[PDB]
Design a protein that fits this description.
Length: 295
């Protein structure tokens, strides 16, 4: 069946000039060239018989230097009806556990552990236990404080979720982070549901522990399986996106799995990577034109 390449820039650095899209399509002897968003994203249907690996290296070579992402996939099933998206450093700019640690005066110490867990150098569950234990005693008021003053939504996120919902997709926010954050963040962005770990408290302060059992890599896989079964679909009907090692299970199971702004060891394990685009990249991956977007 037929393949399509999609080139995607960040809308804040929209370097996919018309001449550049034409040069790319000539580089793969393309049948055509379809603009999804001017200066931002185009579709390049590949001639029948080209290996997807060929187009990728060919397009990346032509684009070498420019901050433009490349994805290649079969055209037929590219628009998905499930979104499962990671929260920390994916749909928000921050790591909620690092921002909590700042309130304990321990941001750098905790952030260094978080970085190793993100990269896969330590298992997620013991890293979460270690970091949360350092939050013991923090007043519950800290949560609202952090959300209101230091959490920011990743560009494109609301448009991604809302455009997908407009076209009937079911959308879920998953996280090894905490429900105190995912509940508010899911509501701000517009997700159908969220699932995360739970911080334990004595009613006034954090205990420094997480509700058992701890949700990590396999929990994100299991949630994708649960959603797909519940909506009468399969994981192949889902697009999954995350940034960290603990997202690779759902990224690999989903029909379309995207490593977003991930560091090399993680992006190396995903079939699609978006290093330059924002979350609108996931709409272009699915073939949406900007005219389709919820504005
Ligand atoms: Mg993450």
């Amino acid at each position: 069946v037929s393949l399509v390449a999609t080139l995607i820039a960040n809308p804040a650095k929209a370097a996919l000039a018309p001449s550049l899209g034409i040069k790319a399509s000539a580089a793969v002897n393309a049948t055509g060239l379809y603009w999804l968003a001017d200066d931002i994203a185009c579709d390049i249907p590949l001639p029948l018989g080209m290996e997807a690996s060929e187009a990728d290296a060919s397009l990346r070579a032509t684009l070498d230097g420019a901050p433009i992402d490349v994805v290649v996939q079969e055209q037929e099933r590219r628009r998905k009806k499930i979104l499962i998206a990671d929260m920390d450093s994916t749909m928000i700019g921050q790591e909620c556990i690092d921002e909590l640690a700042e309130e304990a005066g321990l941001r750098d110490h905790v952030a260094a552990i978080t970085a190793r867990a993100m990269n896969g150098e330590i298992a997620f569950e013991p890293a979460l236990r270690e970091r949360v234990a350092l939050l013991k005693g923090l007043p519950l008021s800290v949560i609202d404080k952090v959300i209101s003053t230091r959490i920011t939504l990743t560009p494109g996120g609301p448009q991604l979720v809302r455009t997908m919902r407009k076209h009937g997709a079911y959308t879920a926010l998953v996280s090894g982070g905490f429900t105190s954050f995912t509940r508010r963040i899911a509501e701000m962005i517009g997700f159908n549901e969220e699932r995360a770990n739970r911080l334990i408290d004595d009613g006034t302060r954090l205990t420094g522990t997480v509700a058992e059992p701890i949700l990590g890599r396999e929990a994100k896989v299991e949630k994708l399986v649960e959603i797909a079964e519940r909506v009468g679909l399969t994981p192949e009907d889902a697009i999954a996106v995350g940034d960290g090692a603990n997202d690779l299970g759902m990224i690999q199971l989903a029909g379309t799995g995207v490593a977003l702004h991930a560091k090399p060891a993680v992006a190396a394990q995903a079939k699609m990577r978006i290093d330059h685009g924002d979350l609108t990249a996931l709409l272009y991956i699915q073939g949406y034109r900007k005219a389709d977007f919820v504005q």
